[PDB]
Design a protein around this ligand. Structure first.
Ligand SMILES: N#Cc1c(O)c2c(-c3ccc(-c4ccccc4O)cc3)csc2[nH]c1=O
Ligand SMILES: Nc1ncnc2c1ncn2[C@@H]1O[C@H](COP(=O)(O)O)[C@@H](O)[C@H]1O
Ligand SMILES: Nc1ncnc2c1ncn2[C@@H]1O[C@H](COP(=O)(O)O)[C@@H](O)[C@H]1O
Lengths: 423, 172, 292
């Protein structure tokens, strides 16, 4: 008879992307919990030992009404027990199957809660890359419950993601192509199809042949039924845009007319009922609570004092255009370019570091982590080099900074010395 | 201080005997293919062994020991650092420079092409103001075409919860 | 009263905009290029970085551009060799860094602005050594404006300007409508004032010539002919945006502060019953009165 900390284990609810989740009932009371079980032997061979640590440190700090809460994590000499919140409504995928489609009155509500949960994750630099109606759980009151992170990852400043994970469907065009992506724009794409599957009942990109399926996704062409109104139609085409730069963001969706209707004001950070119903980020820093919170809302609602606008009265300090020798404004470009062989470029930057005395380690055939010691301050100035591919017969060398004088200036002076001594 | 004894082999019924049971046989509960039993064991080394369908058998993967008489049983070492999550991950991460090179390509991500210094801000706000930069364009160097011997560099860094795009006019 | 205890609470960090642009010059940069760079980047002033000693040494502002012009200007027939040849490092020889931590109070900011008689203060993070933002008077007063309805209103805000005696009302530096720019630039150097109200023969203010209107000589590259009148230099904006701006001695302080933050200018011209001058209430005058 299996007991793990007052909880008795029962039937398996299912096996996730990592680990087996099974229901647990309190021995004395009957309180139901879901216990995800992680084998310690699986973890070391996958080298995900550091990735489980990250997911645990983040899931225990999460607190959203539409995300499965983690109550505690029990450690055993052979396995880890992640006891968490239990819901009885089952998968959303099974709810879309029970009914034909979902009424837009209810489909809107479920979509809002889900995107709320997504937003919360992106604000904590966590991107859940396995968003699907199989991972959206339901409770007794038909509320959304995002779960099964596993394929989730953190977002660092100036760092892209590489891993092509998720279902064949629901996956962004740049994921199935194995390209580099930012993070958030992928979760919006999986939410687009989730919105489609919620309303239509079927999938926008579906084919028995997997190569032909990827062809449809990259093509980004899907059938829009006529029982979908003009309003919600525009939103879907915006969320499922192929080019990630044209694709909608969470702020874009939140301003959409179909989304703003019947929207509860407790779901989003700058909504009227948020500053009084949700404990924010001033909890860790601290009449004192209300005073600090009030200070932020004043600074927040002054969007023209902290953030620039986009194309009234001209600002007094606005500069006139510099006259001829008006001149055409110069354009800024990324790093430096070349059209020679990739091997020639790396062979050229290698001899370039000899003349400047750079110490460096090789992480990849196109990723160098260089380092120079500042002769004046004594500090070490290091940066990141990465050769990319542009168009067809074009290349680009990228420069990235790594954390008595000034670090920003040190990064600039080190780049300039390398750029000058490089053809 | 729990401890998980799982039997992965086949069988209609599996027992567990060890020093804890005084080598008596403890009935294991069955799932689909797993025979498991969680006990409360102190810190140290404990000798255990399974009994499946009639024959004394041990788990091949688990470390063994010989009691100077041919008897071979499994050995589990219940450490004190097995009951703390991070202290167990530390022992699982600890158990898991300046080169000259040697040299024995990814497509450019379209996000780094959104130059922040090339977009207008509308003649309504302070000239020093800029739009909020993407988190992935941070720390990346942007430059201009050199004109009359002066090189101009720029990058967007982050301090606390703010963003400063610094430009450096530097003659060469 | 409660205004002083306010600025002792808020750090300088609360003034820094979420995203901003910070031009920086190397000391070895040719000074002429540095002045053009200020025009192209839309920035009013830039921190100076001495590459040799690896530390910020000061600021380059439009005042420096006025100093260079006034010091070396023979005529419109001969070019200004030094302005074309000098470097930032070399000019600083012919003519200490004042900064502040972002974690320092907003009260220390206003204090450091007055004690050092400067208009722009470089906010430098002591942790990373990097420069973050350039603090000004317009930035500070506009910040307090966001909280004049949060922090209770003291008694003096309802008082007239004549009662509070705020600003300068003696020996007001002015220029004529036909006053050459060089002569105007000389007034900027001698009396060290931010702006010079322009007056006609009748004695009324027709226009105002600030220090900001001088870089327009570097923008249009008309800096080699300083013999032209001050009106000719204000012709580029004479057709649009104006303007004028002024106040009275009977107007309340609150009405005046509201007038400054709205027009986003540094000063008002205190006129009489007509358009003739009577005094100048500056932003440095108001901030000084809400600290002492
Ligand atoms: N997949 C998987 C998996 C487990 O089931 C367990 C188990 C386990 C085995 C069986 C049971 C069980 C036993 C009787 C009835 C129901 C059960 O879920 C509970 C937990 C303990 S550690 C572990 N590690 C795993 O990777
Ligand atoms: N045109 C002017 N003539 C005389 N004094 C002035 C003038 N403009 C400003 N002031 C005074 O100079 C001091 C600093 O002002 P500002 O240079 O505008 O910060 C204050 O005492 C002002 O009242
Ligand atoms: N009282 C005023 N009336 C009209 N224009 C002004 C006034 N004060 C400043 N300006 C203008 O505001 C711009 C910035 O000057 P400053 O306020 O000195 O930074 C310049 O174009 C000035 O001519």
């Amino acid at each position: 008879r299996v007991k793990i900390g007052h909880y008795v284990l029962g039937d398996t609810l299912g096996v996730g992307t990592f680990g087996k989740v099974k229901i647990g009932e309190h021995q004395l009371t009957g309180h139901k919990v879901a216990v995800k079980i992680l084998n310690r032997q699986k973890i070391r061979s996958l080298d995900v030992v550091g990735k489980i640590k990250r997911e645990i440190q983040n899931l225990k700090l999460f607190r959203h009404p539409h995300i499965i809460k983690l109550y505690q994590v029990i450690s055993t000499p052979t396995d880890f027990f992640m006891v968490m919140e239990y819901v009885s409504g089952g998968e959303l995928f099974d709810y879309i199957c029970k009914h034909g489609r979902v009424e837009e009155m209810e489909a809107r509500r479920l979509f809002q809660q889900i995107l709320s949960a997504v937003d919360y994750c992106h604000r904590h630099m966590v991107v859940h890359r396995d968003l699907k109606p199989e991972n959206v759980l339901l409770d007794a009151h038909m509320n959304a419950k995002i779960a099964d992170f596993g394929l989730s990852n953190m977002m660092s400043d100036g760092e892209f993601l590489r891993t092509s994970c998720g279902s064949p469907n629901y996956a962004a065009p740049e994921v199935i192509s194995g390209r580099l992506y930012a993070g958030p724009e992928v979760d919006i794409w999986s939410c687009g199809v989730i919105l489609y599957a919620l309303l239509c009942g079927t999938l926008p990109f579906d084919d028995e042949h997997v190569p032909t399926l990827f062809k449809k996704i990259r093509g980004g062409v899907f059938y829009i039924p006529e029982y979908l109104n003009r309003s919600v139609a525009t939103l879907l085409m915006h969320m499922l845009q192929v080019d990630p730069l044209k694709r909608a963001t969470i702020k874009d969706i939140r301003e959409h007319e179909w989304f703003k209707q019947d929207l509860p004001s407790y779901l989003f950070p700058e909504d009227p009922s948020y500053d009084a119903n949700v404990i924010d980020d001033e909890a860790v820093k601290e009449v004192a609570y209300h005073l600090i919170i009030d200070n932020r809302r004043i600074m927040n609602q002054a969007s023209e004092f902290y953030l620039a606008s986009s194309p009234l009265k001209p600002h007094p300090e606005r500069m006139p255009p510099l006259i001829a020798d008006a001149v055409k404004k110069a354009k800024w470009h990324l790093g430096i370019r070349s059209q020679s062989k990739p091997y020639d470029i790396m062979a050229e930057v290698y001899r370039a570091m000899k003349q400047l005395d750079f110490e460096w380690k090789v992480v990849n055939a196109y990723h160098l982590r260089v380092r120079r010691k500042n002769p004046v301050t004594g500090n070490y100035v290091k940066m990141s080099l990465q050769l990319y591919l542009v168009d067809n017969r074009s290349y680009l060398l990228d420069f990235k900074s790594i954390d008595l004088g000034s670090h920003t200036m040190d990064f600039f002076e080190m780049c300039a010395s390398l750029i000058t001594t490089l053809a | 201080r729990p401890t998980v004894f799982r039997w992965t082999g086949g069988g209609k019924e599996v027992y567990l005997s060890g020093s804890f049971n005084n080598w008596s046989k403890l009935p294991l509960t069955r799932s689909h293919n797993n025979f498991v039993a969680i006990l409360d064991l102190p810190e140290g080394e404990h000798q255990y062994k399974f009994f499946v369908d009639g024959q004394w058998t041990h788990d091949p993967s688990e470390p063994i020991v010989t009691s100077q008489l041919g008897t071979v049983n499994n050995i589990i070492q219940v450490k004190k650092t097995d009951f703390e999550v991070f202290d167990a991950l530390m022992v699982d991460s600890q158990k898991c420079q300046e080169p000259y090179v040697c040299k024995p390509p990814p497509i450019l991500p379209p996000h780094l092409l959104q130059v922040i210094l090339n977009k207008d801000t509308g003649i309504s706000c302070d000239p020093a103001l800029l739009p909020e930069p993407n988190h992935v364009m941070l720390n990346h160097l942007y430059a201009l075409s050199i004109k009359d011997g002066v090189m101009v560099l720029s990058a967007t860094h982050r301090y606390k919860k703010k963003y400063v795009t610094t430009l450096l006019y530097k003659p060469i | 009263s409660v205004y002083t205890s306010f600025m002792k609470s808020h750090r300088c960090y609360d003034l820094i905009p979420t995203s901003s642009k910070l031009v920086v010059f190397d000391t070895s940069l040719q000074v002429k290029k540095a002045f053009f760079a200020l025009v192209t980047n839309g920035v009013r002033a830039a921190p100076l970085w001495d590459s040799k000693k690896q530390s910020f040494v000061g600021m380059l502002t439009i005042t420096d551009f006025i100093n260079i012009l006034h010091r070396y200007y023979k005529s419109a027939l001969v070019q200004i060799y030094e302005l074309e040849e000098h470097k930032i490092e070399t000019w600083r020889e012919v003519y200490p860094l004042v900064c502040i931590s972002p974690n320092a109070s907003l009260f220390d900011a206003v204090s450091s602005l007055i004690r050092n008689k400067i208009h722009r203060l470089p906010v430098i993070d002591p942790e990373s050594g990097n420069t973050l933002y350039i603090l000004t008077h317009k930035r500070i007063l506009k910040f307090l404006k966001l909280f004049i309805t949060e922090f209770p209103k003291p008694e003096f805000m309802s008082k007239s300007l004549e009662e509070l005696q705020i600003g300068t009302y003696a020996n007001i530096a002015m220029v004529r409508t036909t006053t050459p720019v060089y002569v105007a630039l000389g007034i900027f150097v001698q009396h060290r004032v931010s702006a010079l109200p322009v007056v006609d023969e009748k004695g009324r203010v027709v226009d105002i010539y600030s220090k900001f209107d001088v870089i327009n000589l570097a923008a249009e590259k008309t800096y080699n002919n300083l013999d032209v009148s001050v009106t000719k230099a204000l012709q580029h904006r004479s057709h649009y945006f104006e303007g004028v701006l002024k106040c009275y001695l009977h107007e309340t302080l609150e009405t005046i502060i509201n007038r400054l933050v709205e027009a986003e200018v540094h000063r008002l011209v205190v006129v009489d019953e007509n358009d003739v001058v009577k005094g100048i209430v500056s932003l440095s005058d108001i901030l000084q009165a809400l600290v002492l």
